[PDB]
């Protein structure tokens, strides 16, 4: 047993993975086995979702978080999000399961059978965390791989069938994207938008042309950065700004992943373009707007004048003005007037919601969509009772948007905590006091008194 | 040497579980309180006292099981098994809420036995009895909430039932009927509990992050030996850190640990005083100046007036099922509601 | 070089209060939030929080005391829109729509995040182990949950916690109405965290105070038996361990002071992490357990439980909260 | 002369703590005193 | 607002009597040496 106890390694069993910091072969085994775990969950969870999938029922009523991802890519769906073939879901699941067997074999082999350190076996695969050139080279390889993955998404959108477009004319449909937005003004203006209400930063991307053009830019930028880090050594300011150790690199990745988890939470909660409501259910804003639309339709059919109807407070019961003048839905859903959805945009004119198109141009499919989205709002209990907390036990529903947003907020927060833990520990270990204060050379004893 | 002295020697013998003289009071009473709660939440209904299911046998889960209080018509009856209500019948005694008074009385005497155990072990070991003095605050909470509060009210019915969701009902009842959040004694209790949690976290983190390096292990727990004489962490470094971060810092370890004793104990005692006041319905329900102003001025709104409307909703919507002995029949038109919803 | 002198002063450990770079951000933001909070709590005009032209007065000069006073959250018409002073046409409009709340909470959240960073920074400058900021991340996560994450999930800063005592109680009651937080396991873990934190605080304090070594006479305070900076331990750890091991049993007692103090740090911090996550996950409307009409008799009659009584209380709160703001049957946000 | 006389002390930290306790208690209970 | 009148003097006494008491005990502590 090499480095497999506390006396030789300095780490207890509950920090036992920290014994792998300077064992590149076993660390590679741990990483490859964990990657096998991720791919295993993807495949097994897809097969589990498919085995209980009822294709006529909406996906968001069935507790599905992975089939909507495949369906958004355009695999197995037709117009309106209707499932036309479940076989691509099966293919994705089984290919992930088999690939996870391969990755698990490799992880187990490098973890318990392969060489403990890769430096003697290969200068290419061996590494030292203090060697900044090798770290940037490995980072460059992985940047090229990520750029290729982004270009694979582009290739799916442009050549291999397209993507599901919820904004397609005549309901959502699978559409081939033939003119991606390559203008850097649009792409980096998304990057420079405010994160607050009405702006939404990158969460507010509302068409697939911008999505595909952004992934073209992301793939090219990642490939160029990968070549840049393969061919170049870190500069002096970078060498003086960072801690160069394995725990430090881990803490940097933990902070990045925490930020990405928060962004993914906001993306799945607000965006209905890359998370179409046909698959993930309506957003919270979408469902509130749908309720207002539903009761506007019902009362207009009863003969009410929805433009002049006055609520209890004197604001319009159905229609009011946003603070910048736009005609919006009344009630509490005044907070959600920045919502844009394909079932609502036919009723919008230049000044917001249009009274004449409200009176004359509301189609039965829009009324159906509003009722369906109102009654499948992302509200439910932990034991999956649909509705507000005061609802009785009859509806078994929690929206996949709720599950994804809550789970990834939990993960993002804990990864921020992990970033703080490892960044502090990497700093203390680089300076040499992560094990405690030296009794003979305590720094505060050499400092003057505060008062 | 005398039978009393021999029994004393046996009771104070070193064992895995210390018994002592206090054990005679503690172990039967604590065991019976715990066993009564487990038995009641596993097998015993509340159908005749509250009209509720409250056991696993009826289909409740861990959150919704409770040993419920007796019916309001019992008054403050001790509800002894041999008493005039049950008349020796165990089944009727369970159906009438006798397990509640069983658990409450045996728990009270078990708490007495545990504080006496703290005193006895402190006397034998040779330490000061500050742990028993600190345990006086949970005893004050239990006596004020489970005994004094229902004694001030009409019956045992309005005491908390021994269950998770039943305690949640008790919380919401105190909000709706007593406005217990507005009570300054409850505010002092909250300050004591949250300050105790803060002090616990901050003292633990401060000690763990000002440790001296006393070993080469990267896990520092092995660098402490219980028989060592030196302090395991730097008080000077901790003091300078908190003086520069927060402005003030402890400089006396004994004062720090007494303060850690003092904050949650004082908070719990203040909340117990407030609960005594609520036993007599001496509530901090309302501010009279705000209510005079709101009565004369229909445009004056505060968060306190909104809370009063919420309390009215709680009372009117909760009372027919929470107090079934009153036979409240509130028709739909008398229920206070906002627009829509 | 002026920049080198400024860097030396900022990172100096000889300042009475450490600044650091996190403090370079923290001091102006917390000063701005504090000054605006004091001014708004004393003298702000009423705020139309629900966006229904029904202004709520929260300042002392407009008829409040310390208990009922608050800085009222910004208007529901604003929602999540960024509302600085320069976005308003006048200061009267900014005050009417609850702009001070957005100013205070944004400056406070930035300053408190930089307070956490500053705690790390000073621990690094003093040669300390760095994880006090990790412990402080639990109340900071709680503040982020009630001031930022819950408004984001619900779509309006009007649903953030008001900056006042009675406003806090209003937030709690409406939150229980809409999300059944008492039945949420993360809030139950938080209650276990704070109750256990108070318990273990009282326990550790009483056990250390109980085992203090005699250094003083009966007239003086026992606290004078400890001298600041002394090397010897001021109490007998073995005697406290012997007491607490006889109080329960030997293996429920810490004989290791480092493990004990790690437990004291870890229990309330993890509990408060879980309750802050509970507030955030209920911000995305993943509510507490719903056992309404769970117990059904043989015929099909509903047998009520304590959860049904809780549901009655929640219904009372739900139908009375924001009594003029709802036009439609479902309170969807 | 009574031999049972003892000097009474209250250090500045205790003064600060007691003043904080009194002022915070007054701030808490003043709204209820005014009512 | 129509507040209780004695609520002023009570509050003042609630500050004044304990605080000056502590102040007394502080100042006579400082003059001891």
């Amino acid at each position: 047993a090499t480095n497999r106890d506390q006396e030789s390694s300095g780490f207890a069993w509950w920090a036992g993975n920290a014994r792998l910091i300077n064992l590149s072969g076993k660390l590679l085994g741990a990483h490859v086995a964990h990657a096998g775990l991720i791919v295993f969950w993807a495949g097994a969870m897809t097969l589990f979702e498919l085995a209980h999938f009822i294709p006529e029922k909406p996906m968001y009523e069935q507790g599905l978080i992975l089939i909507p991802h495949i369906a958004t890519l355009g695999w197995g769906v037709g117009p309106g999000g209707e499932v036309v073939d479940t076989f691509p879901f099966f293919v994705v699941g089984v290919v992930h399961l088999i690939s996870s067997a391969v990755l698990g074999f490799g992880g187990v082999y490098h973890a318990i059978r392969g060489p403990e350190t890769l430096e003697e076996y290969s200068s290419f695969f061996g590494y030292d965390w203090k060697d900044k050139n090798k770290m940037t080279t490995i980072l460059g390889f992985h940047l090229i791989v990520l750029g290729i993955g982004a270009l694979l998404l582009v290739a799916k959108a442009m050549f291999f069938g397209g993507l599901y477009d919820t904004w397609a004319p005549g309901g959502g449909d699978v559409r081939v994207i033939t003119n991606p937005t390559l203008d850097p003004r649009v792409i980096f203006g998304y990057l420079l938008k405010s994160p607050f209400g009405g702006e939404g930063w990158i969460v507010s991307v509302n068409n697939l042309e911008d999505v595909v053009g952004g992934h073209i830019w992301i793939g090219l930028i990642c490939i160029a950065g990968g070549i840049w880090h393969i061919l170049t050594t870190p500069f002096g300011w970078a060498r003086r700004a960072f801690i160069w150790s394995g725990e430090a690199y881990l803490s940097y990745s933990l902070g990045a992943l925490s930020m990405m988890g928060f962004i993914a939470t906001c993306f799945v909660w607000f965006n209905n373009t890359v998370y179409p409501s046909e698959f993930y259910g309506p957003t919270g804003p979408e469902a509130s707007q749908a309720q207002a639309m539903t009761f506007l339709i019902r009362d207009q059919k009863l003969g009410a004048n929805v433009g002049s109807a006055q609520g209890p407070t004197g604001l319009g019961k159905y229609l009011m003005r946003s603070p910048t003048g736009e005609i919006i839905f009344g009630g509490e859903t005044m907070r959600f007037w920045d919502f844009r959805g394909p079932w609502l945009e036919p009723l919008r004119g230049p000044n917001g919601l249009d009274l004449n198109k409200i009176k004359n141009d509301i189609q039965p499919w829009q009324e159906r969509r509003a009722a369906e989205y109102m009654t499948h709002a992302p509200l439910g209990s932990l034991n999956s009772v649909g509705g507000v907390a005061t609802e009785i036990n009859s509806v078994n529903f929690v929206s996949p948007r709720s599950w994804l947003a809550t789970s990834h907020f939990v993960l993002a927060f804990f990864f921020l905590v992990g970033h703080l833990w490892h960044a502090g520990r990497a700093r203390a270990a680089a300076a040499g006091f992560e094990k405690g204060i030296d009794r003979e050379s305590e720094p505060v004893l050499s400092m003057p008194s505060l008062d | 040497r005398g039978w009393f002295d021999i029994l004393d020697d046996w009771l104070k013998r070193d064992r895995f579980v210390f018994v002592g003289w206090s054990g005679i009071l503690l172990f039967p009473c604590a065991y019976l309180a715990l066993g009564g709660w487990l038995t009641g939440t596993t097998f015993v209904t509340s159908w005749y006292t509250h009209g509720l299911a409250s056991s696993y046998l009826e289909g409740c889960n861990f959150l919704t099981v409770a040993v419920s209080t007796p019916a309001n018509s019992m008054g403050h009856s001790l509800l002894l098994l041999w008493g005039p209500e049950a008349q020796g019948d165990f089944t009727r005694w369970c159906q009438l809420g006798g397990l509640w008074t069983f658990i409450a009385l045996h728990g009270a005497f078990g708490l007495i036995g545990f504080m006496l155990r703290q005193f006895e072990i402190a006397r034998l070991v040779g330490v000061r009895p500050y742990n028993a003095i600190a345990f006086s605050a949970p005893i004050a909470v239990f006596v004020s909430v489970f005994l004094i509060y229902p004694l001030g009210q009409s019956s045992w019915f309005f005491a908390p039932s021994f269950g998770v969701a039943a305690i949640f009902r008790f919380l919401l009842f105190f909000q709706g009927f007593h406005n217990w959040t507005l009570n300054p004694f409850h505010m002092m209790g909250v300050a004591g509990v949250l300050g105790g949690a803060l002090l616990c976290a901050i003292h633990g983190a401060t000690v763990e992050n000002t440790l001296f390096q006393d070993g080469e292990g990267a896990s520092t727990f092995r660098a402490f030996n219980p028989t060592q004489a030196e302090e395991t962490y730097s008080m000077v470094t901790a003091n300078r850190f908190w003086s520069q971060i927060f402005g003030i810092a402890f400089s006396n370890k004994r004062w720090l640990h007494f303060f850690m004793l003092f904050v949650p104990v004082t908070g719990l005692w203040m909340s117990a005083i407030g609960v005594v006041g609520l036993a007599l319905n001496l509530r901090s329900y309302d501010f009279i100046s705000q209510e005079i102003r709101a009565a004369e001025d229909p445009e004056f709104e505060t968060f306190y007036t909104k809370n009063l409307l919420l309390n009215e909703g709680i009372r009117a919507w909760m009372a027919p099922q929470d107090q079934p002995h009153e036979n409240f029949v509130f028709p739909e038109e008398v229920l206070p509601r906002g627009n829509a919803l | 070089n002026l920049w080198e002198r400024f860097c030396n002063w900022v990172t100096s450990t000889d300042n009475r209060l450490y600044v650091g770079w996190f403090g370079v951000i923290m001091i102006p933001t917390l000063l701005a939030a504090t000054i605006c909070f004091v001014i708004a709590f004393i003298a702000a005009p009423p705020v139309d929080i629900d966006g229904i032209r029904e202004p709520v007065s929260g300042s002392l000069l407009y008829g409040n005391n310390i208990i009922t006073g608050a800085v009222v959250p910004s208007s529901n018409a604003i929602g999540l829109h960024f509302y600085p002073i320069w976005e308003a046409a006048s200061l009267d409009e900014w005050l009417y729509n609850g702009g001070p709340y957005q100013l205070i909470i944004f400056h406070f959240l930035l300053g408190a995040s930089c307070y956490m960073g500053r705690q790390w920074e000073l621990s690094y400058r003093l040669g300390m182990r760095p994880w006090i900021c990790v412990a402080y991340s639990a109340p900071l996560a709680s503040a982020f949950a009630v001031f930022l994450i819950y408004p984001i999930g619900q779509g309006s800063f009007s649903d953030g916690m008001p900056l006042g005592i009675s406003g806090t109680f209003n937030f709690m009651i409406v939150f229980q109405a809409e999300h059944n937080i008492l039945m949420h396991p993360f809030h139950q873990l938080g209650v276990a965290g704070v109750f256990g934190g108070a318990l273990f605080c009282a326990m550790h304090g009483s056990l250390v105070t109980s085992s203090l070594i005699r250094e003083t006479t009966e007239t003086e305070s026992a606290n004078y038996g400890y001298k600041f900076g002394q090397e010897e331990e001021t109490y007998n750890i073995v005697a406290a361990h012997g007491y607490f091991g006889r109080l329960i049993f030997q293996y429920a007692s810490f004989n290791n002071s480092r493990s004990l103090h790690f437990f004291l740090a870890a229990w309330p911090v993890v509990g408060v992490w879980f309750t802050a996550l509970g507030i955030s996950t209920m911000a995305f409307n993943l509510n507490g357990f719903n056992f309404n009409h769970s117990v059904i008799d043989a015929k099909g009659n509903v047998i009520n439980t304590w959860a049904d009584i809780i549901n009655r209380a929640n219904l009372g709160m739900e139908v009375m909260h924001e009594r003029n703001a709802h036009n439609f049957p479902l309170d969807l946000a | 002369p009574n031999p049972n006389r003892q000097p009474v002390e209250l250090n500045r930290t205790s003064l600060y703590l007691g003043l904080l306790l009194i002022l915070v208690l007054a701030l808490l209970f003043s709204s209820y005193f005014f009512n | 607002m129509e507040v209780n009148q004695l609520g002023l003097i009570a509050t003042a006494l609630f500050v004044l009597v304990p605080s000056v008491f502590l102040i007394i005990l502080y100042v006579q502590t400082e003059s001891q040496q």
Binding site: - | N239, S243 | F228 | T13, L20, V24, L27, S30 | -
Partner: peptide, 30 residues
């Protein structure tokens, strides 16, 4: 009258904060 009382008590607390931070008993390390 009540507003003046609240602001006075709050200002006394802030003054006490100032004196407790900057005019404390210095921790003299022995």
């Amino acid at each position: 009258m009540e507003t003046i009382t609240y602001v006075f008590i709050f200002a006394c607390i802030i003054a006490l904060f100032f004196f407790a931070i900057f005019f404390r008993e210095p921790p003299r390390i022995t």
